Paper text:
In bacteria, topoisomerase IV, a tetramer of two [name] and two [name] subunits, unlinks daughter chromosomes prior to cell division, whereas the related enzyme gyrase, a GyrA2GyrB2 tetramer, supercoils DNA and helps unwind DNA at replication forks. Levofloxacin is a broad-spectrum third-generation fluoro­quinolone antibiotic.
In both cases the DNA is bent into a U-form and bound snugly against the protein of the G-gate. The methylpiperazine at C7 (using the conventional quinolone numbering; C9 in the IUPAC numbering) on the drug extends towards residues Glu474 and Glu475 for [name] and towards Gln460 and Glu461 for K. pneumoniae, where the glutamate at 474 is substituted by a glutamine at 460 in the Klebsiella strain. For [name] topoisomerase IV, one of the O atoms of the carboxyl of Asp83 points towards the Mg2+ ion and is within hydrogen-bonding distance (5.04 Å) through an Mg2+-coordinated water.
Numbering used by the authors:
A (entry chain A), C (entry chain B): 3 to 484
B (entry chain D): 415 to 545, 557 to 570, 577 to 640
D (entry chain C): 414 to 544, 557 to 569, 577 to 640
Write the structure that this text describes.
DNA sequence: GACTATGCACG
DNA sequence: CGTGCAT
DNA sequence: AGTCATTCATG
DNA sequence: CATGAAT
């Protein structure tokens, strides 16, 4: 009927249970592919369903429901909001979901509910899933014990640093900002060649974060500090021009703001400064951003000290903020604070496992085939007696047995031979088959090398990272300043 | 609730009455903020022919409509004192959008006639097809030189402005009361208390095939 | 630029569209299967996904999502609510959806959101869909033009009368009460034999509605008017009993209440009668209903006239209400007020098209197969010649032409032969094929008869309707009083 | 009133059910024995009574209505004899977040109604994991299968038989054993300071 | 996750 | 007023 | 289809 | 005072 437990014990089996799960399976990105579980499931499920960049948008609610019923046993709001976020290009440096409809704005207005919008994976998101079908990554049973899901994606680009992550669990939080794809890949490639590389040298390739929202990042040494330790405070400041209006008045024009800042709240707080006259000078605040351009006009009064006003806004609004690195990720099942070096190196080791696994898989396929093609080449030399033998067999299983015993074919070859359609007996061209046998042998040699020789493999990995860069590289948005 | 225009000008500015908050957002994003204002209508609008003027004054959508249009309602309605030169009804192209127009129209007819008589009430025309074409005929022509839009919620803000909100790129129906008697017997049969007349109007005019 | 339109023109055009749509495709059931479009879609969709009664529940959100992305372009709440209703056994006499979890109550409290609940088609819902894969029912393209959906279901029982419908569009509304499955089927079977049967006779099989919620139905006269014209006003009175209590105090106990009535409100309104002392003698009111039985106890005071109280509650509360038939359904694309005869014959005519289509489809399948089987029977006696002739051919097509020209096989026979797997040259039993040949001839004859003779087909309808009645019959729940 | 009250007032056998979620709250209302069982749905994670201020803590709906539904007041102005239930029963999902919720309620009852937890009045229902069995061992004895994801996937019928019926149920009874090592545990897991917690996790949580 | 308002026909 | 698909 | 509040960590 | 997956 009733069993006692201590207050001290109850609060122990519970908070441990919760703590472990929120750290491993909710708030914190995997260090290799840079995804929280909800995002990986989102991407995996949409990809399983062929809802890719090259096909028609699919209703958001259909996608969300499948994710919920197959992989992610939580609310649809949370799944949907997560899916929506991965589609907002002012939050993601390289978006992984393309969404048709109101998916929010820099002003932070609610996205349309999932009954209105429609979605599909972006092309680049395809590269996170590249080769997932090739037994390249470890799979587990879903909550349901009905279906397998991947525990990490193949990640053909270094998404952890490229898109970032944030980041609140129990006993740990995470803040990793986004970086430029070409830059992060240049660093990875250098490190593949020079494994013991030092931060100073890595920063010749990866000078610092690259926000989708652009702006100005100030703090070379804190950037360095963060790349070494995973912690660091940097300054992020709006791009600003001044415009000399008629009649001796000036006007400050903002065109890029700090990452994670709600444009509309910022505009209101700056106008609050004007309405309250905390500092003198501001004539009018005017948000002039249209569908193709961010532009805020802070018109000043005649004989207004524009440097004073600007500086004050920099300090007392989010026109300028501090950004704090707190790079925590999940490495071998546990939370790690990590700098640029463990991040890139984990990624490199991950791609290694991936490429090795991919290659075992293709080689396996190529062998099974080569083995059959070898049997068929043989069969043709003895067609008449092989048909006779099957004619004399009692049934399928007896026919296979007789082919093994009388002519040494293996099971796999016997199965192939015996499941041929009658019309195949019209063929006697061994040459076409021999061409195939040769192409398979070459294919197997390439793959087997990759597997047996570390250098051959690392070249492949560089060759593939450069392709990804050539394809998806775009220019820096955020300027760097000492 | 309302998203006002950036500068006040009762001669240019436009009021978009938009079906639902979600499409409200897509129009807030794609508008020209200098002269276009957005007022999203949450839900089916109140049938102002079937209901009491009391309960009608108690309706949120109505109360905030007579207020942002800023000219009071009914027989105390002064058009000169209006706030916009164009009131634009922008719904989905689904049957329910048709219904919402119906309801709104019978409001501007019953309690703000002057605004509809002076031809200041319009109806936007979102594109049915995206290959953009508005008529099934324009559809077979683009295929010469397809996403079939199920509503304003499947359009991106840039797409919206381009096709329907942009004063240069768009087409609009201008509601024009051309025969006062034949338009009274029409809003009454359709939107009024009596149910038999309506059943018969449906029976006479709606071909089920 | 713009284009002018008349108010009278614009309005008529718009309300035209809304009227037609909300009449044909929203608020009113098709007279044959008794489903509103959203209900058909729910069933069809779940059924296509194999979410049937014989398999695991499946998260509701997944079902609603597929429904919303393949068939029904409306809100998830409308779809989920409809799905929910079909699972409530106090609204449906024969529930068509089984739901695990909080699916609501007779107290009208909210069902759990679709993220919480799981569902599947009920076993009887299976019978509405039976033979849908056999081209028995007209299909149309969905809003996508990506997929075909059914415009009506096969309906192997008369769902319209059995589960009812209700019912509010433009210019028309509908209320059709639920009925006992076996009684409806008895009526239908009679009318199949006696196509001109009149109400009074049908009413020997179908005496009146049968609510899931039970109670007493008073009004034989108005039932006939309803079954005759489509409209009628019958009475519905709560089943009740009296219990004796100590201290010479009697107690009124209600064990069944009127269809569509919310138990919680009814219990408050009755208690309002006590509080307002509207009739003398009420000590206390109490809902004693629990998971296995409805039970409202109305404890009376000592020298209290139990006949006065009971009667007053009947008149002035909903312990007794009036129910109004207003049977309207979509027939040949337009709304139609209908009595029992239009309904049952529309059903009979529909079951006819279905069995005829079903039979053509199966006959065609059997003929095609028979044709192959005749070929294979011939082949076995020339097996070696046929093998030799195939070896002698240049390729597949040359093999077939040689089979046709040398042995007069047809194109379809040759194709079958030439695509047999080698191992079948072991399975060489002509008697087994002859057994199949005979089975097939017999099958084709039975089916031919059905297609060529109206009586044989009506007999097949009766025999099926009876299998369903035998399998799903339940006792009346509501009593009748003239 | 978010609450669903027991029909008759009996502080000697009455039971208060704090259920994670309005949804599960529904099944609880439907499956209960209404004579002596009341239902209180908690809507969302309960406020952390250690971290938050006694100002905001008392301006909280979930907290404020338990302070009332329980009928004994709170803090040092608290009488255990003016109570309303013999047993207060916390019924959450058998998941991680249910674990979390049990944790935030336990710390409230400890910090602000210690006597109730001291008289062994606070409990924790144990909903079934499998379909019934609770242990990974009990399913193998049945082997000679549906896995429950929440109370929201449970029918009112089943919920009763399995976890609400005083005849067929198992309730862990919270007992404050060593007040001082219990005070260390709550104050470390739920307190304002992060480093203590982080270390408690680093030390006690087996990641593998 | 509950709550909030409308349309539409009908007693 | 309350019903049930819709917004 | 918005709106309301709570956890968790951090500056 | 936000942030973003969770309730
Ligand atoms: C279309 C939106 C319109 O707004 C709605 C409501 N409001 C109308 C305006 N009032 C000011 C406040 C309340 C409402 F009360 C309920 C619903 C609702 O259940 C719902 C749905 O999809 O199920 C959708 N909507 C609703
Ligand atoms: C689990 C439920 C719990 O209740 C919720 C809220 N409340 C908590 C209690 N408050 C007194 C009133 C507000 C809330 F404000 C927002 C959400 C919400 O966004 C949400 C979701 O699934 O996305 C789910 N829930 C919410
Ligand atoms: Mg939420
Ligand atoms: Mg600042
Ligand atoms: Mg729509
Ligand atoms: Mg709704
Ligand atoms: Mg009555
Ligand atoms: Mg849960």
């Amino acid at each position: 009927n009733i069993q006692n437990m201590s207050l001290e014990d109850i609060m122990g089996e519970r908070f441990g249970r919760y703590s472990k799960y929120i750290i491993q399976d909710r708030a914190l990105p995997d260090i290799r592919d840079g995804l929280k579980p909800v995002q990986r499931r989102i991407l995996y499920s949409m990809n399983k369903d062929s809802n890719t960049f090259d096909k028609s948008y699919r209703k958001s609610a259909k996608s969300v429901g499948n994710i919920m019923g197959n992989f992610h046993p939580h609310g649809d709001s949370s799944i949907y909001d997560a899916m929506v976020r991965m589609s907002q290009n002012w939050k993601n440096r390289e978006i992984l979901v393309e969404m048709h409809g109101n998916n929010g704005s820099m002003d932070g207005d609610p996205p349309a509910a999932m009954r209105y919008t429609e979605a599909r994976l972006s092309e680049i998101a395809g590269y996170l899933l590249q080769d997932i079908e090739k037994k390249t990554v470890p799979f587990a049973w879903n909550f349901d014990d009905t279906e397998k899901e991947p525990t990490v994606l193949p990640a053909a680009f270094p998404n952890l640093l490229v898109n970032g992550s944030t980041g609140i669990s129990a006993g740990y939080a995470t803040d990793i900002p986004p970086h430029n794809l070409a830059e992060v890949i240049d660093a990875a490639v250098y490190m593949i060649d020079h494994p013991t590389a030092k931060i100073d040298k890595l920063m010749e390739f990866l000078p610092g974060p690259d926000f989708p929202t652009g702006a100005i990042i100030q703090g070379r040494d804190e950037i360095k500090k963060a790349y070494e330790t995973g912690k660091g405070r940097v300054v992020v400041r709006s791009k600003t021009e001044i415009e000399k209006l008629k009649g001796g008045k000036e006007q400050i024009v903002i065109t890029e703001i700090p990452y994670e800042i709600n444009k509309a709240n910022l505009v209101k707080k700056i106008d609050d400064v004007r309405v309250n006259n905390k500092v003198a000078g501001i004539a009018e605040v005017r948000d002039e951003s249209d569908r193709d351009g961010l532009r805020i006009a802070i018109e000043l009064k005649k004989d207004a000290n524009t440097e004073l006003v600007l500086n004050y806004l920099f300090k007392y609004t989010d026109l300028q903020i501090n950004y704090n690195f707190n790079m925590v990720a999940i490495d071998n099942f546990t939370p790690r604070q990590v700098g640029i070096v463990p991040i890139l190196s984990s990624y490199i080791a991950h791609r290694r496992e991936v490429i090795l696994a991919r290659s075992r898989f293709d080689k396996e396929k190529a062998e099974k085939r080569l083995h059959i093609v070898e049997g068929l080449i043989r069969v043709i030399s003895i067609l008449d007696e092989v048909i006779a033998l099957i004619r004399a067999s009692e049934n399928k299983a007896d026919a296979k047995e007789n082919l093994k015993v009388s002519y040494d074919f293996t099971e796999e070859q016997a199965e192939a031979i015996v499941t041929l359609q009658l019309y195949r007996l019209t063929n006697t061209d061994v040459v076409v088959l021999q061409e195939e046998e040769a192409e398979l042998r070459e294919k197997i040699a390439m793959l087997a090398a990759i597997i047996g020789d570390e250098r051959t493999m690392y070249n492949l990995m560089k060759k593939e990272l450069r392709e990804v860069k050539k394809k998806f590289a775009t220019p820096r948005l955020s300027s760097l300043e000492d | 609730k309302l998203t006002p225009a950036q500068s006040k000008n009762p001669a240019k500015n436009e009021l978009y009455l938009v079906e639902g908050d979600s499409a409200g957002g897509s129009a807030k994003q794609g508008r020209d903020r200098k002269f276009q204002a957005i007022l999203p209508l949450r839900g089916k609008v109140i049938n102002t022919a079937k209901a009491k003027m009391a309960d009608i004054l108690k309706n949120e959508e109505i109360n905030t409509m007579i207020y942002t249009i800023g000219a009071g309602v009914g027989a105390d309605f002064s058009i000169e004192d209006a706030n916009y030169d164009k009131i634009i009804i922008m719904t989905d192209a689904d049957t329910d959008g048709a219904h919402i127009q119906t309801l709104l129209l019978t409001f501007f007819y019953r309690y703000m006639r002057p605004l509809v008589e002076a031809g200041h009430v319009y109806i936007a025309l979102p594109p049915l097809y995206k290959m953009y074409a508005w008529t099934d005929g324009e559809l077979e022509e683009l295929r010469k030189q397809l996403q079939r839009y199920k509503g304003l919620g499947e359009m991106n803000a840039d797409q919206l402005w381009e096709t329907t909100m942009n004063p240069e790129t768009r087409t609009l129906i201008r509601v024009t009361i051309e025969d006062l008697a034949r338009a009274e017997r029409r809003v009454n049969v359709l939107m009024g208390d009596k149910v038999e007349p309506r059943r018969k109007w449906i029976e006479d005019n709606v071909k089920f095939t």
